[PDB]
Subunit: 116 residues, 4 copies
Amino acid sequence: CPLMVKVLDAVRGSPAINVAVHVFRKAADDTWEPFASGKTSESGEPHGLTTEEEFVEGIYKVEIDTKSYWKALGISPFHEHAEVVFTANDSGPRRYTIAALLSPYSYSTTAVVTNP
Amino acid sequence: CPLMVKVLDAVRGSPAINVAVHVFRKAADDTWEPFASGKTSESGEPHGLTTEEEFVEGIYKVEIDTKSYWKALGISPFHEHAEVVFTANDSGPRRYTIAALLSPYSYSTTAVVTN
Amino acid sequence: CPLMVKVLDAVRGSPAINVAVHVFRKAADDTWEPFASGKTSESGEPHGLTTEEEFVEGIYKVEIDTKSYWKALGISPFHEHAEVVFTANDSGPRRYTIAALLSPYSYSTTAVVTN
Amino acid sequence: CPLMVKVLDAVRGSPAINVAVHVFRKAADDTWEPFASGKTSESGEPHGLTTEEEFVEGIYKVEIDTKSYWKALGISPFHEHAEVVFTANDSGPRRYTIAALLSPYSYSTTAVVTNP
């Protein structure tokens, strides 16, 4: 898995489960193209988003549907979503882990990039 | 201003100065429209982004040019920029501060909504 | 004040009000000695913790009573408190702000040191 | 491993490697007693800090030597260390993961608590 996403809930101290994760790539024509999507499992990760063959150099956008998560728990959050935009692999293939820590009025995002 | 932005540099322990901040509003066509922009001052805030008569309810996007900021410091960054997308609701208090804490491979954003 | 503390509540999107903040200094005997304390006001800051003549170089500890704060909100917290331990150096700028962002199972702390 | 610690470096986008982790328990006499210690591996985790038998109810302190980490990389950080103090297992045994995200003038700490 060259692109892994891990989502945590800072209010409950648990993995954020059943959260939708949508990934887009920037296309030749400056639009975002759908690339991959999934839902976080009990571990807070969507398993198998992409492959090493498919995950080529490019600008990627990872959108995490935090609004639907907090609403399904009865909280009206501040953010519409949490997005992470980055250039990938432009020095060769890497494995990326995007971690997102969620609160109703706050989120943080961190990337860990390791040589595959 | 009913909308303030405050940007901090976690590597140097200072306000993030001279960072471009762009604000968009969501229009009927589900496309973003330029609304406000500014450069952070030495306090890490771009002074006077908007006013309470233009800042009506709706969905707003705040884009912080983090990549240019880290490039000016000679530090390689992960993110292309930091974006904050939110709904402003009148029922809620009357002033929004979006705080952003920046590191090269991490950022956090927080909304402080005060009456 | 050469030392300010600012405490934010990430769950409610407001300053964390009425939070106890205790400051200690490290003494020769490697034991902490009470130095300053206060309760955060409605801005999330305990006004006037110290002065520039008492705030000499040394190692300081800032303890924020997060557990009492979350208990008052009826929200079960992980941490017993949040502590920030640091060295104040004159060579460094002349005002310290320790910012703390609180959630029940997470907190982050940041030092903004300005001239 | 009922107590796991994961340390990340927000400047380099990598696990924080070779970081010392010291764990103490609060003793009957109100002093901190040494309970366990280790160094983070290439994954940013110290492996095998404690056991389920040893990790009883109590107040625990996890100290992460962040100062030595940043100094070994040529940075003078703000914090002397990052500490996490919490009550453990007081509702029955749990597995705790303490994550710490490190910058020179900032750190964050998050706990994920899962039923064993």
